[PDB]
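Case study: AlgQ1.
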Amino acid sequence: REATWVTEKPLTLKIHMHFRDKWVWDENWPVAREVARLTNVKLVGVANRAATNSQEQFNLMMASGQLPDIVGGDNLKDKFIRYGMEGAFIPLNKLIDQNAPNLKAFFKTHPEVQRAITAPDGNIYYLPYVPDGLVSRGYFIRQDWLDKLHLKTPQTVDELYTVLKAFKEKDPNGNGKADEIPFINRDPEEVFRLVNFWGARSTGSNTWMDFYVENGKIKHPFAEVAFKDGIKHVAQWYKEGLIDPEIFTRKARSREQTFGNNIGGMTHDWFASTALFNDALSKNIPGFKLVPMAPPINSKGQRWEEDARQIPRPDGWAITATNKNPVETIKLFDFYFGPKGRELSNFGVPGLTYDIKNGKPVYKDTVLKAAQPVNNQMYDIGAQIPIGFWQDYEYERQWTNDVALQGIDMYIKNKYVLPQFTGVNLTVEEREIYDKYWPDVKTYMFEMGQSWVMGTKDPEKTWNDYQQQLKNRGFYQVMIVMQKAYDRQY
Ligand SMILES: O=C(O)[C@H]1O[C@@H](O[C@H]2[C@H](O)[C@H](O)[C@H](O[C@H]3[C@H](O)[C@H](O)[C@H](O)O[C@@H]3C(=O)O)O[C@@H]2C(=O)O)[C@@H](O)[C@@H](O)[C@@H]1O
Ligand SMILES: [Ca+2]
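Here is what the predicted structure looks like once written out:
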């Protein structure tokens, strides 16, 4: 028996958690095993290991006529709210109030987090992934390639074009082959963010393809004429091979591949893990220096960093109506928001990945000096996963090197980060329109975006058809309710 036990009799529950198109909940995870030891509740995964579409797996689960006890994963906020109000997920308000002291204390000190996760009916249907930190992504460029080609740090988009063209054509890796790929990215959606260079938005927040506000008006980036004009330039850069031809396909290991083989010249990605490649490749590629770069002055005369950490993220977990032990489940959920539970969900397992030194969790040298970024190492053992948990920036600080730290400091000091969209408060009937049309519109917008970038569709020629399709698919009905909710709030 332990003092942290939430049940005397051992309990096993079924969890469907497919996340980030790559992972599922693993009961064999060191973190999962330690939480199970401490709480006396074991979670067994029921999601499909083979699948590469997390959203599709949720949809199949909901249509399968049989629900597990817990459902977790990334980008499930809208689905948690929709199916919560339908009765598939249970409200947590009373359960938290009666059984979850840690969450109660958290929500009163973080009222904006409670607001962001609350449904239009007043119910909380899930607990969120709560990130910790301020900045997220920044631009990184190969300083050693700039120096080798005797080029200055590009200050404008036009200067950047010249630099990326030189990366492609002037053989900076010195192997006599045109193998260089100037701009690479882990995230296909970052190719859309390049429209920032031409004064167009791609998203209002860390959530992909999110709305934004300009002059008291709700706008969606993909519906704006600025995007039409901006994506033409992105398409041109793709055409000329300045953007990774595989930007839509390469994905997760883009940096390991392109930086590791000394072909990648630039990216836009998280400071800590991106700067880590300087250390990992220090001997394999002598002189490898990937440095933070201020965003280039765009066509609107400004230096935009569009991305920032989003607190909370639209990720987390919920309790189903089929769960026979909702009290034990909410108590397990609450363990994660206490000191020990928070430490495990961030750092891993004590004596394995970290040690308590002077009362502080300190990562082992084997973790810090490893080839893999620490967050990747955490995923492998069940930490830093998009369950209901509270991230602790102290975990991140420990593997944020001086190059990363100084880049973060530059971005904070110079205020590059654009004001982020914090959402609007929809009513139940407004949310019905939102849930009916928006997911399918977003999928269509992505498809059109990819087509424009790859040149299979001409953005100028197809814009009228695209706008007609947006209307036919209900996008403008969504826009009406979004503005209606904004005007009511502000
Ligand atoms: O320095 C870091 O790498 C930084 O990463 C943060 O994690 C990110 C991660 O880098 C990546 O961007 C990931 O992207 C997800 C996305 O959030 C969404 O779920 C999508 O459906 O799948 C993507 C994917 O992984 O393929 O998002 C992570 C996140 O937590 O937002 C943190 O680990 C941070 O502490 C770290 O320093
Ligand atoms: Ca070369």
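For the exam, be able to explain this: The pocket of calcium ion (ligand 2) is lined by residues 171, 173, 175, 177, 179-180 (CB under 6 Å).
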